[model samples]
Target: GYEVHHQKLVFFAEDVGSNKGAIIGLMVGGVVIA
Candidate 1:
């Protein structure tokens, strides 16, 4: 299978603390969209 898009932007000992933070650009990183 060929993945047209991919983002394994994993970091060590990190977590998605909150959705609000992400929007505020605090939790800046890849997001899961569905």
Candidate 2:
């Protein structure tokens, strides 16, 4: 079985700015906008 885990990002621009909304929407099962 897999164990619980945690991670952090030091340079996370990919999930910042304009992508923040998309990321949040995606998490809720919305098809990401590219």
Choose the strongest candidate by TM-score.
2
Off by over 4 Å in 2: 12-34
Report the lDDT tens digits of candidate 2 across residue range 1-34.
9897796666435445543343442264545574
Estimate, for each residue in 1-34, the C-alpha lDDT of model 1 and write its tens digit: 8777765664443564545432333455666454
Give Cα distance to truth, residue 29, candidate 1, Å: 21
TM-score of each: 0.17, 0.21
Give the number of the best model, judged by lDDT. Answer: 2
Task: Give the Å error, residue 23, model 2.
Answer: 23
TM-score of 1: 0.17
lDDT of 1: 0.50
